Scaffold this active site. Structure first.
Site, PDB file in Angstrom:
ATOM      1  N   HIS B  41       1.235  -1.419   0.270  1.00 25.45           N
ATOM      2  CA  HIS B  41      -0.142  -0.039   0.070  1.00 25.45           C
ATOM      3  C   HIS B  41       0.593   1.268  -0.307  1.00 25.45           C
ATOM      4  O   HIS B  41       0.353   2.550  -0.252  1.00 25.45           O
ATOM      5  CB  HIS B  41      -0.650   0.108   1.211  1.00 25.45           C
ATOM      6  CG  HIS B  41      -0.336   0.349   2.695  1.00 25.45           C
ATOM      7  ND1 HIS B  41      -0.306  -0.665   3.638  1.00 25.45           N
ATOM      8  CD2 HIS B  41      -0.081   1.727   2.569  1.00 25.45           C
ATOM      9  CE1 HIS B  41      -0.042  -0.661   4.594  1.00 25.45           C
ATOM     10  NE2 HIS B  41       0.444   1.373   4.179  1.00 25.45           N
ATOM     11  N   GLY B 143       3.075   6.118  10.529  1.00 24.40           N
ATOM     12  CA  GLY B 143       4.644   5.517   9.576  1.00 24.40           C
ATOM     13  C   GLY B 143       5.275   4.430  10.040  1.00 24.40           C
ATOM     14  O   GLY B 143       6.539   4.151   9.317  1.00 24.40           O
ATOM     15  N   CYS B 145       4.278   0.845   9.355  1.00 26.82           N
ATOM     16  CA  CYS B 145       4.138  -0.126   8.038  1.00 26.82           C
ATOM     17  C   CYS B 145       5.638  -0.500   8.018  1.00 26.82           C
ATOM     18  O   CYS B 145       6.205   0.329   7.684  1.00 26.82           O
ATOM     19  CB  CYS B 145       3.451   0.139   7.206  1.00 26.82           C
ATOM     20  SG  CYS B 145       1.331   0.753   8.122  1.00 26.82           S
TER      21      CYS B 145
END
Ligand code: Q56
Ligand code: Q56
Ligand code: MG
Ligand code: MG
EC number: 3.4.19.12
Lengths: 302, 302
Positions: B41, B143, B145
């Site tokens: 993503h 932030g 991920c």
């Protein structure tokens, strides 16, 4: 979101752990530049443990009595000395993985990360508070002496604890990196007890702010109390007195939630007098006191 | 002695964390040999988040759309591909700090260490269990991920989790390192909820053995129950059924304490029916279920 007991990443400290062997005793050392730091009781024997004279034991040692192992590579000891309760072994090779570091002696109520090691080899990482009675609630087995506690600031490792011994209640005691014990303890195998402990009030309040930042509000109330009346309650439940310095240190948390410090104190007071009645706070059924206000800010940025 | 929530030392994983930037979105990647792994993503935009077609978004990308930063050194992307929900970016430089590693998909009830990172930079380490509903109770901000969960066995890092998203209840969801979500979740910003959770019975029992190994015995009793009658109680209190495989996995702990598994079950039963009545177990006022039997053995050697 979420709130967990969080240690600092431990790689910078892993690169410094070595094994120190003296006779039949093996524990851990900390290798920074060309010096290895370890507890001086590595030079003890099983009978000397009762009440040893360390200056005598060390005079009787030679550089070749100390076996230092960094991974596989055996390190050559070229000098040895004693500073309070830590032994300093000068080695011929500077540690190429030496981080930027400082030695710091912390105050009760401050937290740090522990890298538990055995035979020079890191086993695990966890978070600890220095209790008001100068013990830590650690997890340490035989062979763990020489493990260190530390905080990391930007890139700089601040070492604050080296592990020496376990007390009869199962809590743990040790020194700063200059070898000065936290608390009144001494490094001999005698009957030493932790004094009675107290709850770290400023940390409980920090953790309640972490709860509010994370959605737990059932314990809030409209009331605000005074510093004097709150400290009366603290004494009754064996909490440290609350100081104006602590109120001020809780400033940013107070401003991020819009809840004045003395407003949160009246919630803590109600929680002390009534318990939780089956509810929990951040997954705990007790009031938690091993998170500093710095710890909460670090983990609760949003 | 002592029993703490303990993470694995994280140095081997710290050496692999990088920053991946695509447009205005930046998160973390895992750099192993010459491939960087990150959540797919990162190629989304703020409007595509509702229901993106990733095959379309990726066809529209070129190698120069991906900025990979390892410390200061910018890494050159020479190839890109998608496997389930993870993006694989081939880079021109093999990571010299690549550890011995494996990708593993874990079962509910297993634990792992999380290295929370922001902008390629490790922030902290903590321990997590994969809940029966395939969420974890993490601590993750925006932030984060691309942060990974892992276990370490001898010298071999087993990666089991990569972080993708937070659910409305504040728990967290992600994939194995081959990009397959744990649970039924999908990587789009829609209304997804965790299903109802259950308590990990075999872990509660492991933790009660850790208590006995550490001196907490007030909850023991003389009674022993049957597997059938215990599972009746488990259903009533929303505990996972106890299997013979679990009984067998608790073997070593049972043998070290001299307390048969079904003996400990009758203590758990009494604890479920009566609560703790103000007492604690290993510093907790609740029954803890995020310690596997392996976790207890590892920390309770003596
Ligand atoms: C150093 O490695 C060791 C760390 C203790 C051992 C058990 N848990 C710990 O943290 N420190 C000592 O052995 C220390 C020696 C000094 C001369 C003071 N003595 C000590 O801790 O005595 C208490 C104690 C308690 C339990 C055990 C269990 C098994 C072996 C030794 C001990 C010692
Ligand atoms: C990736 O870094 C991020 C991690 C989330 C953000 C907040 N805590 C986390 O664990 N993941 C996402 O933003 C993810 C995007 C995918 C397309 C699914 N969406 C997501 O988590 O949505 C829920 C959410 C909840 C709180 C916040 C707070 C601040 C910013 C974003 C979100 C997103
Ligand atoms: Mg109030
Ligand atoms: Mg029983």
């Amino acid at each position: 979101s979420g709130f967990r007991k969080m240690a600092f990443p431990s790689g910078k400290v892993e690169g410094c752990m070595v094994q120190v062997t003296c006779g039949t005793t093996t524990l851990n050392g900390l290798w920074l530049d060309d010096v290895v730091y370890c507890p001086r009781h590595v030079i003890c024997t099983s009978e000397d443990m009762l009440n040893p004279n360390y200056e005598d034991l060390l005079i009787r040692k030679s550089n070749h009595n100390f076996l230092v192992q960094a991974g596989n590579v055996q390190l050559r000891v070229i000098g040895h000395s004693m500073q309070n309760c830590v032994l300093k072994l000068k080695v011929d090779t500077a540690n190429p993985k030496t981080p930027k570091y400082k030695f710091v002696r912390i105050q009760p109520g401050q937290t740090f990360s522990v890298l538990a090691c055995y035979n020079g080899s890191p086993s695990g990482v966890y978070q600890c508070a220095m209790r008001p009675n100068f013990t830590i609630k650690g997890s340490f087995l035989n062979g763990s002496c020489g493990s260190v506690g530390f905080n990391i600031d930007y890139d700089c490792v601040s070492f604050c604890y080296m592990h020496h011994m376990e007390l009869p209640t199962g809590v743990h005691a040790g020194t700063d990196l200059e070898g000065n014990f936290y608390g009144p303890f001494v490094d001999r195998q005698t009957a030493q007890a932790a004094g009675t402990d107290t709850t770290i009030t400023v940390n409980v309040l920090a953790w309640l702010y972490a709860a509010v930042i994370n959605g737990d509000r059932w314990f809030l109330n409209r009331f605000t109390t005074t510093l004097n009346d709150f400290n009366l309650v603290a004494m009754k439940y064996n909490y440290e007195p609350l100081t104006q310095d602590h109120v001020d240190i809780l400033g940013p948390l107070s401003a991020q939630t819009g809840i004045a410090v003395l407003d949160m104190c009246a919630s803590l007071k109600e929680l002390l007098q009534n318990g939780m009645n089956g509810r929990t706070i951040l997954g705990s059924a007790l009031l938690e006191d091993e998170f500093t206000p710095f710890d909460v800010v670090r983990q609760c940025s949003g």
